[PDB]
Amino acid sequence: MATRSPGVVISDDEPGYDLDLFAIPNHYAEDLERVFIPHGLIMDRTERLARDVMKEMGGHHIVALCVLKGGYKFFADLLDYIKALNRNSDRSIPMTVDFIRLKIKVIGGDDLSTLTGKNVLIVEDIIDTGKTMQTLLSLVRQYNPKMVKVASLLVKRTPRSVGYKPDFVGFEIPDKFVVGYALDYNEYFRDLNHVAVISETGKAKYKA
Amino acid sequence: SPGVVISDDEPGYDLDLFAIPNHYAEDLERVFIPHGLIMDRTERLARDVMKEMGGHHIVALCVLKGGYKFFADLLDYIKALNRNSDRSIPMTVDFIRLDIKVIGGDDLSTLTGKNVLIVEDIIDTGKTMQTLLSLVRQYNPKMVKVASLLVKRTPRSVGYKPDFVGFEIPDKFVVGYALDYNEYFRDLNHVAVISETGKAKYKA
Amino acid sequence: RSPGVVISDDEPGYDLDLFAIPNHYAEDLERVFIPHGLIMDRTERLARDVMKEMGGHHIVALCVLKGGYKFFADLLDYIKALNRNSDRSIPMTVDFIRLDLSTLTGKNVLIVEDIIDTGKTMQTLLSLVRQYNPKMVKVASLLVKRTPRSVGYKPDFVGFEIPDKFVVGYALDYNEYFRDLNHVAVISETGKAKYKA
Amino acid sequence: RSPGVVISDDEPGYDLDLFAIPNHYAEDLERVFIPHGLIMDRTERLARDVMKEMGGHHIVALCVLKGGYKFFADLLDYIKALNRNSDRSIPMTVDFIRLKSDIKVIGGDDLSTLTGKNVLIVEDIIDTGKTMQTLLSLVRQYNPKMVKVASLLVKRTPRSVGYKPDFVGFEIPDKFVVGYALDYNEYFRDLNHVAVISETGKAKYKA
Numbered sequence A: 001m002a003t004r005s006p007g008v009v010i011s012d013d014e015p016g017y018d019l020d021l022f023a024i025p026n027h028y029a030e031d032l033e034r035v036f037i038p039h040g041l042i043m044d045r046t047e048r049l050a051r052d053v054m055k056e057m058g059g060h061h062i063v064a065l066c067v068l069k070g071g072y073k074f075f076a077d078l079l080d081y082i083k084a085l086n087r088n089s090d091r092s093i094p095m096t097v098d099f100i101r102l103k104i105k106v107i108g109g110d111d112l113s114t115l116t117g118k119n120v121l122i123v124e125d126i127i128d129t130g131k132t133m134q135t136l137l138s139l140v141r142q143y144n145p146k147m148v149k150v151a152s153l154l155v156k157r158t159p160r161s162v163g164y165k166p167d168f169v170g171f172e173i174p175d176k177f178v179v180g181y182a183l184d185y186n187e188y189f190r191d192l193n194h195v196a197v198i199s200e201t202g203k204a205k206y207k208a
Numbered sequence B: 001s002p003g004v005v006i007s008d009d010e011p012g013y014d015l016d017l018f019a020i021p022n023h024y025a026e027d028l029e030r031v032f033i034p035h036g037l038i039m040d041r042t043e044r045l046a047r048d049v050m051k052e053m054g055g056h057h058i059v060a061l062c063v064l065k066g067g068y069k070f071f072a073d074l075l076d077y078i079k080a081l082n083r084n085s086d087r088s089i090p091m092t093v094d095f096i097r098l099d100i101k102v103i104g105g106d107d108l109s110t111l112t113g114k115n116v117l118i119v120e121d122i123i124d125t126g127k128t129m130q131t132l133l134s135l136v137r138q139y140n141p142k143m144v145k146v147a148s149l150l151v152k153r154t155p156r157s158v159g160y161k162p163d164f165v166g167f168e169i170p171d172k173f174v175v176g177y178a179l180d181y182n183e184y185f186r187d188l189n190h191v192a193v194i195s196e197t198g199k200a201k202y203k204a
Numbered sequence C: 001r002s003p004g005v006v007i008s009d010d011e012p013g014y015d016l017d018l019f020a021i022p023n024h025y026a027e028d029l030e031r032v033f034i035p036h037g038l039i040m041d042r043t044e045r046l047a048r049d050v051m052k053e054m055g056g057h058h059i060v061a062l063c064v065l066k067g068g069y070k071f072f073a074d075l076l077d078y079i080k081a082l083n084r085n086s087d088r089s090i091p092m093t094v095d096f097i098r099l100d101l102s103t104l105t106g107k108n109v110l111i112v113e114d115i116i117d118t119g120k121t122m123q124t125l126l127s128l129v130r131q132y133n134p135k136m137v138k139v140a141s142l143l144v145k146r147t148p149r150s151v152g153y154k155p156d157f158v159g160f161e162i163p164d165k166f167v168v169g170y171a172l173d174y175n176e177y178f179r180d181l182n183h184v185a186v187i188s189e190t191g192k193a194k195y196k197a
Numbered sequence D: 001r002s003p004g005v006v007i008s009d010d011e012p013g014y015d016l017d018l019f020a021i022p023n024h025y026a027e028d029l030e031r032v033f034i035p036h037g038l039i040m041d042r043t044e045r046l047a048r049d050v051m052k053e054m055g056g057h058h059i060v061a062l063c064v065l066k067g068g069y070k071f072f073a074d075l076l077d078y079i080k081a082l083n084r085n086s087d088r089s090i091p092m093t094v095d096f097i098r099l100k101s102d103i104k105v106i107g108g109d110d111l112s113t114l115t116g117k118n119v120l121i122v123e124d125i126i127d128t129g130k131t132m133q134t135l136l137s138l139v140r141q142y143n144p145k146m147v148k149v150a151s152l153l154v155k156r157t158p159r160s161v162g163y164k165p166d167f168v169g170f171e172i173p174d175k176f177v178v179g180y181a182l183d184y185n186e187y188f189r190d191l192n193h194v195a196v197i198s199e200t201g202k203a204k205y206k207a
């Protein structure tokens, strides 16, 4: 089946789910408004992305690059599904991993010369304006990878977007601020499996 | 009304967004309830069940065949609670096929004095569970409760509602997650709607 | 053929305190014998062996209740995972039997059991199934005991070959208890007396 | 007080042919040493131990990259499962650091963020224990409320300076192991089991 896709499209008027339908951390009981993307649905979509990734990139050594901090959950789960494929199939390919954090200035990570001649998969939590990815791609290409692709859990529909589109997309979401599944608000809500929308009292509670 | 409400106009998801068995590729129309969503809802139901029933030995009764997946997953989440909490209760299990006649379980004297949890895939008219409940009460359980993954909004309902509900769904035929169409589609993780060519292929 | 993961007669098992155990069985178990996760790892490999050997024709998976139900559910979950992530897939239907089967005729029948001890139950079961004209019959058993009481029957797929010891857990019961336990374990003296029939 | 699951010096591990293994590592591994699922079962219990000791106050969970990233993700998943199914839970924030040779810390938030917090350092393996002593000495300059260390693996080795972590998955022989994000020259991180490398594998992937 097809490997390029705009992702699961979540509409502008998506109501999400009452928190009382799900198991939610107690300490965030009053801080969230709605569950927006259930953890399980993220897992289902990520399973299919892993297959799409192996189809496009499985022909040569893959370097999977995790963009910290918010990419870490998507990265771990995506790679677990890729590993499941590679131990149950006829063919497989080695995969190495690295981690970078952005200040854009690139923090941590291996020497980027280790990307040379490899199939590089950049893994991100969200594309909003896309400026971060564009600057990051422009960097990585200078090391002459055999290919560079971007997997992003979330892509926002926003008038501030520039036209950048990643190669693999989990969900295309409206222009709302979401948290959970490692996406934070002032470092909070990373310890939440679902993607959710913050309540005004949660926004006020954890404001810097 | 107390479960996850899926509306009549729910469009579901394109098959191409998910991992789908090849042999059902032409036979399904849409994914209706993704497997992971069933899991998330089932996690919360497990907790609801322990809260109401965990005071006394539980006998969990799986209604075959369609009940088997929900049953195994619900009980896994209940086990996960019980091995990570301060207190828990023994649970024993039995399996039946469907006085209403009950095929293949233990003597129903095993229910006497127990907290009995009946586990179904779906409630539609509600007659099956009404009839099964009428029989079960005669064995004097301590309590009897029903958990159903799905409940249909149907005008043919006799007004029976279960105690625990995963999803309230439209009056549409669904398959997947052990729900079949002529024994097919049980080997599918998601709840889905069958395509026209799918109906024709597997028609009995 | 694979004989399964061989568990030695002297296998010490694991201290219960190193694992998550349901509180209601804390005094009733002696040791963890096969951790639940190891069961999953082995079952994942068996699912692949099953699909390589049987995946050419429609499969009917037949669960032997009650004890086979956890192994059955997990094994079929791993086979479904294979079937939705490969080019090669085959329809599977399911049925249950407790110790009509028109569900079996002309299909590749996979019988799923918790444990083979003497093998007499399985030989009797196999004799019945053959009468429904299946295309193929194979048997997957989570556990096979090493025992001189055996009549020589060996399943096609085996998870673990274990000593002649009474085990519980992962749907293996003692007077219907311990089915609600993820690990395979050995029962304590307290447990044997408490749940004795 | 638990020394962890003790894996003895003579334990033979498991035939590779009994598990699902990526084919690109088929000749490169000798035996499966600790099956992925056993790691999961042990990690579940650790998460409960951690919540019992640390759950009274906001936890900052510190991942020591790269090798600790799998243990870290899984351990936090089990802690999240406790927190969404209990009445009692506490927030957790996270941070990631890399250590580079003594050692300096790379990446990370300002260590001031650790002041007054319950700090949980998550590591893949303790061998001599010098790395953890170093990281602890740094962390302790910022006066955390408490600091604890969870390590998946601890080696039995004469070279130990005597440091013992607070939570331990497995106590293993002095053998070089790979898998579950532990590497040999960056390979084998993409393997779910912990395994011992073959002589072939050592020669194939040698720097």
Ligand SMILES: Nc1nc2c(ncn2[C@@H]2CN(C(=O)CCP(=O)(O)O)C[C@H]2OC[C@H](O)P(=O)(O)O)c(=O)[nH]1
Binding pocket: A067, A068, A069, A070, A071, A126, A127, A128, A129, A130, A131, A132, A133, A176, A177, A178, A179, A180, A183, A184, A185
């Ligand atoms: N929790 C949340 N975070 C969001 C959201 N939209 C954007 N963002 C991002 C906020 N960001 C960060 O906090 C970066 C550091 P972190 O990964 O958490 O350690 C980056 C924003 O992501 C988009 C890219 O910057 P760009 O595409 O270049 O515009 C959102 O709806 N929820």
Ligand SMILES: Nc1nc2c(ncn2[C@@H]2CN(C(=O)CCP(=O)(O)O)C[C@H]2OC[C@H](O)P(=O)(O)O)c(=O)[nH]1
Binding pocket: B063, B064, B065, B066, B067, B121, B122, B123, B124, B125, B126, B127, B128, B129, B172, B173, B174, B175, B176, B179, B180, B181
């Ligand atoms: N796959 C599907 N099955 C459905 C559907 N609605 C009803 N049913 C059920 C058809 N049924 C069976 O096939 C029973 C045997 P099985 O569980 O498959 O081994 C029973 C129906 O469930 C509802 C009860 O009968 P009742 O509440 O008394 O009306 C549906 O939308 N999809």
Ligand SMILES: Nc1nc2c(ncn2[C@@H]2CN(C(=O)CCP(=O)(O)O)C[C@H]2OC[C@H](O)P(=O)(O)O)c(=O)[nH]1
Binding pocket: C064, C065, C066, C067, C068, C099, C114, C115, C116, C117, C118, C119, C120, C121, C122, C165, C166, C167, C168, C169, C172, C173, C174
């Ligand atoms: N919990 C345990 N059960 C065991 C054990 N060894 C045998 N058995 C079996 C006892 N059995 C049952 O309880 C059958 C009913 P159930 O599946 O629990 O609904 C059958 C025994 O399995 C072996 C076959 O009989 P056979 O190969 O013909 O000798 C054991 O070490 N632990």
Ligand SMILES: Nc1nc2c(ncn2[C@@H]2CN(C(=O)CCP(=O)(O)O)C[C@H]2OC[C@H](O)P(=O)(O)O)c(=O)[nH]1
Binding pocket: D064, D065, D066, D067, D068, D124, D125, D126, D127, D128, D129, D130, D131, D132, D175, D176, D177, D178, D179, D182, D183, D184
């Ligand atoms: N794959 C493996 N790695 C090992 C093993 N014993 C040690 N080590 C470690 C080698 N190390 C690294 O490769 C650090 C970089 P990374 O986390 O992989 O990005 C550090 C060693 O861990 C122990 C500490 O150094 P210390 O307690 O201070 O002696 C082993 O049996 N297998």
Ligand SMILES: [Mg+2]
Binding pocket: A067, A070, A071, A124, A125, A126
């Ligand atoms: Mg990001």
Ligand SMILES: [Mg+2]
Binding pocket: A070, A183, A184, A185, A186
């Ligand atoms: Mg952020």
Ligand SMILES: [Mg+2]
Binding pocket: B063, B064, B066, B067, B120, B121, B122
């Ligand atoms: Mg039913």
Ligand SMILES: [Mg+2]
Binding pocket: B066, B179, B180, B181
């Ligand atoms: Mg049916």
Ligand SMILES: [Mg+2]
Binding pocket: C064, C067, C068, C113, C114, C115
């Ligand atoms: Mg049996």
Ligand SMILES: [Mg+2]
Binding pocket: C067, C172, C173, C174
């Ligand atoms: Mg029995």
Ligand SMILES: [Mg+2]
Binding pocket: D064, D065, D067, D068, D123, D124, D125
């Ligand atoms: Mg380390």
Ligand SMILES: [Mg+2]
Binding pocket: D067, D182, D183, D184, D185
């Ligand atoms: Mg290393």
